[PDB]
Amino acid sequence: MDLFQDKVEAFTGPTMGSTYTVKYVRSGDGPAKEVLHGEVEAILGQLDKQLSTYRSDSDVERFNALPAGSCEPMPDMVRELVAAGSQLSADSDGAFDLTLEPLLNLWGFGPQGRGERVPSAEDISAARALTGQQHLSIDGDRLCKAVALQLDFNSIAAGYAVDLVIDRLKALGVQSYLVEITGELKAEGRKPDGSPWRIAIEAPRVAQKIVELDGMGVSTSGDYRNYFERDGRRYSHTLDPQSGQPIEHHLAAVTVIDKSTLRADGLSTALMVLGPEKGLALAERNGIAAFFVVREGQGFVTTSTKAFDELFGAGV
């Protein structure tokens, strides 16, 4: 390194149950880091107030309490996300669904869930009748629901948060940055030496595929280290929207790379719903850059898509 050189600042903080980390290059112009730390905290406060199902005074919880047939005014975020969600649903053949909260609370995986309980085939049938993206619509500044929908934004919130933080760093003059919120992240520009921002994707055999992010967000659903079979059948908190039950298949993690970190968080969730086979086919069909970790024969196999291979090479 050189003696006179722009600084690479870093801060981190607590989330509701995890951490974020921002890193950025600060020029003489550019903003101080406590300013950004406060801009990032502000943004996270709005997300929590508008979209968290874990607090009762949230906008989404006010919407969730309402009965079938309700139209209710909602803030910009919620409508932005409902809309983004609608597209994700269409692009992923329904594997992406914001309306699973009743099946989540039924299977114990939710905010009002004691947990770890197997519900009947009757309660499942009842709860699925309170689900369905097609029943959600936007009307001016109102969100409407045709059945007693309960929304949950967790499959896309962290990614959206990353994109929002980046709009703000850009608006304040920052050019080069790596923003990570509970695992979702995006980076752009280069460090002062000229090096790029790099992430590692886990690629067990414990190999690692290293990629350079410049204008691209990454999202990883699952972690190959958490793969459980309860009684020789797979245990997970991921539900098929179409069937009421949890997923049976062997996909242990999937990583998506897209310019919109919101989209990566979403498609990532959808691919893990779909599994190793339907996952790959969709990803290839729609041209998604993705890297799958499939648990095969007491070990792991990895598979990358075509779009991923053009962006990053095939090797490791």
Q: Which is nearer to Mg ion, 97 or 265 (CB)?
A: 265
Residue 245 φ then ψ, to 5°? -85, 170
261 labeled part of a ligand binding site: no
265 is in an annotated binding site: yes
Q: Could you tell me the smallest distance in angstroms from the CB atom of residue 217 to Mg ion?
A: 12
Consult the annotation and say whether 155 binds a ligand.
Answer: yes
In angstroms, rounded to a whole number, what is the distance separating the alpha carbons of residues 66 and 136?
A: 13
Q: For residue 95, give the nearest of 272, 236, 288, 294 by alpha carbon.
A: 272
Helix (H) or strand (E) holding 125: helix 121-128
Closest contact distance (angstroms) between CB of 272 and Mg ion is: 8
163 binds Mg ion (CB under 5 A): no
User: DSSP character for 266?
Assistant: H
Exactly one of 155, 176, 255, 302 binds Mg ion (CB under 5 A); that residue is 155
Task: Kindly state the tokens that stand for 47.
Answer: 């997300």
Identify which of residues 99 and 155 has a Cβ nearer to Mg ion in the complex.
Answer: 155
Q: What residues numbered 107-126 form the site for Mg ion, per CB under 5 A?
A: none
> CA triplet 20, 228, 89: central angle to 5 degrees?
60
Quote the least distance from Cβ 259 to Mg ion, whole Å.
17
Residue 278, class by beta-carbon neighbours within 10 Å (0-12 exposed, 13-18 middle, 19+ buried)? middle
- State the minimum distance, in angstroms, from the CB of residue 265 to Mg ion: 4
Computed on alpha carbons and rounded to an integer, the radius of gyration of the chain in Å comes to 20
Of residues 242-271, which lie at the interface with Mg ion (CB under 5 A)?
A: 265, 269
Binding site for Mg ion (CB under 5 A): 155, 265, 269
Q: Where is the binding site, in residues? A: 155, 265, 269
Q: Where is the binding site for Mg(2+), in residues? A: 155, 265, 269
